[PDB]
Amino acid sequence: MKKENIISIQSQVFDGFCGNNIAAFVFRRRGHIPKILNTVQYYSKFKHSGVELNSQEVDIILSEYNKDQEFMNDSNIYFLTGYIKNAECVDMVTKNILELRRKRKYFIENIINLNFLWVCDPVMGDNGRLYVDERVVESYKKAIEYVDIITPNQYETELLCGIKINEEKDVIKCLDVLLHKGVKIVIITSVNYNFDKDHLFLYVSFFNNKNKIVYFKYKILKNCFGSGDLFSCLLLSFIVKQKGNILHIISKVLNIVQNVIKNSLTGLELNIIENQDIIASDGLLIKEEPVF
Amino acid sequence: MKKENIISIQSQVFDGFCGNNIAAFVFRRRGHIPKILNTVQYYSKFKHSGVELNSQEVDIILSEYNKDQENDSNIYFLTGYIKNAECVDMVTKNILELRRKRKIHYFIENIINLNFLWVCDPVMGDNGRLYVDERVVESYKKAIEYVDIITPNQYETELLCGIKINEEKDVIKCLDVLLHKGVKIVIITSVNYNFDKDHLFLYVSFFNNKNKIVYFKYKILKIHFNCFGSGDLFSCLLLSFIVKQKGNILHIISKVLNIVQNVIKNSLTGLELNIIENQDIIASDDILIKEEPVF
Ligand SMILES: Nc1ncnc2c1ncn2[C@@H]1O[C@H](COP(=O)(O)OP(=O)(O)NP(=O)(O)O)[C@@H](O)[C@H]1O
Ligand SMILES: Nc1ncnc2c1ncn2[C@@H]1O[C@H](COP(=O)(O)OP(=O)(O)NP(=O)(O)O)[C@@H](O)[C@H]1O
Ligand SMILES: Cc1ncc(CO)c(C=O)c1O
Ligand SMILES: Cc1ncc(CO)c(C=O)c1O
Ligand SMILES: [Mg+2]
Ligand SMILES: [Mg+2]
Ligand SMILES: [Mg+2]
């Protein structure tokens, strides 16, 4: 039984739930022992007072991890990246993940390689507001080539694709550009259409075991931030442990997010702690809808 | 019922369990929602590669927190690993500002003030050696009078009091000193006597509801393992039981200790405590270690 290594490289906040405040606890609560790298430490998602890791500090932590991993070819390495605020750090994270892969080189374990995965949540913005540089945007575009699974929201997809999304045809072309860049699975977590405001759509795409590409929509009804962060870390925990069919995994993840969402209306944050037994669950639905 | 605020000011590591990697999860898994300020981000307890907040960056976080409370909520500080003396003073200054801004100053409710606690775990060293900036020892001595509950190991007790502990009478002098400097509850988490090599002793002291000092000890069979952080586990569990469970503090200390011993017993394998695998016992509310008086 190869040894599980999950490395989660994201934001941390003094007050609230986002980046690694969600992911570190969801992982641990589900039986995992994640390595944690905090890219920033902010007062809260709203007051970005605090401290950022510069690229050299990222490289010092990550290089030490590559030192322990060299010659130690007995483990499955799983990177989950989210909020990185400057493109040098994004470049440095990418180089370090890349240098690890070079040393150690619809079921999810034949779409991608469970010995080594990079799951990139490309936290750049939402709904017209942008948290990073146009430099960070081009850094992810250079990194997509090396990413196993990318989980942008709709806005972030527009940024990496250079394509505004107004109807489903734009989504398909968007899924297409990211896939031909080398990403193995695209999930666009939420796309909202002008003509259906009560609902939002999650799309997922990938080549099948016959070199043919496949699309699926998930229709969900509607906000508190951090749903995307919950979604991503929940996705890796299902993939690496349960394994099996990705489209089943996604429904199961959606089952948990919705059920936590249902309790975080009385506030502004998600109720990560009040619903921790839900977060630790099986995911028991919204069934895939194929797209052409 | 008032809003609970727990603020854990400790270290963070990339790999392994110490400081806030323990306390955040312990707190969260027990249904609290700690605020979290990582004082350092190191690769591991043994590889202090990484970044350390300076005292201005500590003051940025905590002063923003003080602004949002200048109310109707109980405030519980837990401080642990802090490498830098000026960062220790800035934590002290800010905790005191919060005390100043609200005119602040065996059932635990009658021993301490559950409106506002500073539980100071003054991490400085162990087994004869020191692991902090050396001026940090002076900075924790400045803080003693301001601290409600202080939980040093033996060596840190010796540092704060200026005397070496070789016999029980030395433990009592140390408990007497720290209590008379104004701490409400002193807990020396382990003492190793050159004459009882198979056991560890934990001591607790305080003034009871009659303004008489009492001293209790817990005799722990020394399990011979290779992992640290049980002190961090001890202190966050202590706070959690104090603010949720309340009641008899000596009971609270027996329960914490049992949980700690059980985690250690399922962590004889490796070099880190097996927090995750033993998270369920950690979540709990088998008593092998029990208090005895010392007089
Ligand atoms: N109003 C809503 N009601 C219920 N579920 C929702 C709602 N909005 C989002 N979700 C769920 O939350 C998931 C995350 O969607 P999304 O809004 O793209 O995350 P995000 O936070 O914007 N991405 P990021 O912050 O960059 O990591 C979706 O896949 C839905 O399952
Ligand atoms: N070898 C051991 N056998 C049994 N219990 C132990 C052992 N070491 C520690 N403990 C328990 O853990 C508690 C905390 O240990 P202690 O060594 O006093 O904390 P610390 O030294 O500040 N932190 P650490 O770095 O983990 O040693 C003690 O009070 C005991 O309950
Ligand atoms: C600090 C920080 N980290 C992560 C996210 C993504 O939810 C956000 C924005 O929602 C954020 O502000
Ligand atoms: C960073 C850090 N945090 C906590 C501790 C002790 O639990 C140590 C001691 O080894 C440490 O180095
Ligand atoms: Mg946690
Ligand atoms: Mg997303
Ligand atoms: Mg301690």
Side-chain angles (χ1 to χ4, degrees), chain A residues 121 126 153 156 189-190 200 221-223 227-229 254 258:
Chain A
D121 199 345
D126 203 356
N153 68 11
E156 284 149 7
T189 48
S190 76
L200 51 87
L221 183 97
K222 302 142 54 63
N223 313 338
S227 324
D229 295 329
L254 291 168
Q258 300 305 285

Side-chain angles (χ1 to χ4, degrees), chain A residues 11 13 18-19 42 48 83 123 131 226 229:
Chain A
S11 56
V13 293
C18 68
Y42 282 149
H48 290 177
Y83 188 108
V123 187
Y131 321 128
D229 295 329

Side-chain angles (χ1 to χ4, degrees), chain A residues 12 14-15 25 28-29 31-33 35-36 38 41 43 49 51 53 61 64-65 68 273 276, chain B residues 12 14-15 21 25 28-29 31 35-38 41 43 47 49 57 61 64 68 276-277 279:
Chain A
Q12 195 266 333
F14 177 86
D15 200 334
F25 175 69
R28 287 166 175 159
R29 181 64 179 79
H32 303 288
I33 311 179
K35 270 66 143 139
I36 305 296
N38 295 322
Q41 170 164 213
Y43 177 70
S49 312
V51 298
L53 260 62
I61 300 305
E64 199 73 34
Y65 183 70
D68 289 14
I273 297 327
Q276 66 174 276
Chain B
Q12 207 269 310
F14 182 78
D15 181 32
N21 302 53
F25 184 67
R28 288 159 176 168
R29 182 83 180 58
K35 286 66 185 141
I36 303 281
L37 162 52
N38 296 325
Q41 174 156 224
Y43 182 72
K47 293 236 58 172
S49 302
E57 300 159 358
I61 301 304
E64 194 56 47
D68 290 347
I276 303 316
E277 302 90 323
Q279 95 186 70

Side-chain angles (χ1 to χ4, degrees), chain A residues 46-103 105-108:
Chain A
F46 310 127
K47 320 99 206 161
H48 290 177
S49 312
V51 298
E52 296 141 61
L53 260 62
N54 61 54
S55 67
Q56 252 175 44
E57 308 174 319
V58 179
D59 198 30
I60 277 177
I61 300 305
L62 280 188
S63 277
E64 199 73 34
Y65 183 70
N66 292 355
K67 273 212 319 193
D68 289 14
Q69 282 312 125
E70 206 154 0
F71 319 137
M72 275 273 229
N73 323 96
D74 44 59
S75 66
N76 299 334
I77 284 89
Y78 302 118
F79 282 98
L80 173 66
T81 66
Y83 188 108
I84 303 153
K85 225 172 167 201
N86 83 78
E88 279 92 8
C89 298
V90 173
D91 293 352
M92 194 69 67
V93 168
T94 298
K95 156 195 149 217
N96 272 281
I97 300 188
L98 208 173
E99 290 186 336
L100 209 34
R101 217 203 282 278
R102 306 261 203 237
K103 290 194 261 187
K105 280 215 303 164
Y106 294 8
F107 290 170
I108 186 55

Side-chain angles (χ1 to χ4, degrees), chain B residues 112-128:
Chain B
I112 46 156
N113 172 26
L114 294 175
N115 290 311
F116 180 108
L117 285 186
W118 179 4
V119 180
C120 161
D121 185 11
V123 174
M124 297 183 279
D126 203 348
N127 310 124

Side-chain angles (χ1 to χ4, degrees), chain A residues 117-128 130-133:
Chain A
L117 302 173
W118 179 5
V119 173
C120 168
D121 199 345
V123 187
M124 282 172 313
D126 203 356
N127 287 329
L130 206 145
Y131 321 128
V132 296
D133 300 69

Side-chain angles (χ1 to χ4, degrees), chain B residues 159 163 197 293:
Chain B
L159 273 49
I163 70 137
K197 74 186 206 282

